Design a protein around this motif. Structure first.
Motif, mmCIF file in Angstrom:
data_model
loop_
_atom_site.group_PDB
_atom_site.id
_atom_site.type_symbol
_atom_site.label_atom_id
_atom_site.label_comp_id
_atom_site.label_asym_id
_atom_site.label_seq_id
_atom_site.Cartn_x
_atom_site.Cartn_y
_atom_site.Cartn_z
ATOM 1 N N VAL A 106 1.245 -1.510 -0.035
ATOM 2 C CA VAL A 106 0.460 0.517 -0.162
ATOM 3 C C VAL A 106 0.760 1.496 0.099
ATOM 4 C CG1 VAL A 106 -0.947 1.311 1.721
ATOM 5 C CG2 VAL A 106 -2.235 -0.361 0.693
ATOM 6 N N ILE A 107 2.291 1.359 0.236
ATOM 7 C CA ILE A 107 2.770 1.988 0.325
ATOM 8 C C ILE A 107 3.692 2.758 -0.126
ATOM 9 C CG2 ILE A 107 5.080 2.590 1.819
ATOM 10 C CD1 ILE A 107 4.921 0.959 3.915
ATOM 11 N N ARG A 108 4.291 2.108 -1.883
ATOM 12 C CA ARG A 108 4.391 2.004 -2.664
ATOM 13 C C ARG A 108 5.430 3.038 -2.832
ATOM 14 N NH1 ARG A 108 1.515 0.039 -6.869
ATOM 15 N NH2 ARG A 108 3.296 0.658 -7.888
ATOM 16 N N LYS A 109 5.847 2.994 -1.931
ATOM 17 C CA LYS A 109 7.447 4.015 -1.537
ATOM 18 C C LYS A 109 8.166 4.348 -2.730
ATOM 19 C CE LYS A 109 8.872 1.132 1.635
ATOM 20 N NZ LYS A 109 10.251 -0.070 1.731
#
Length: 12
Positions: A9-12
């Motif tokens: 969900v982060i997808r940093k």
């Protein structure tokens, strides 16, 4: 997963 499930969900 307790962190991986969120990482996606982060997808940093």
């Amino acid at each position: 997963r307790l962190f991986d499930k969120i990482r996606q969900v982060i997808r940093k």
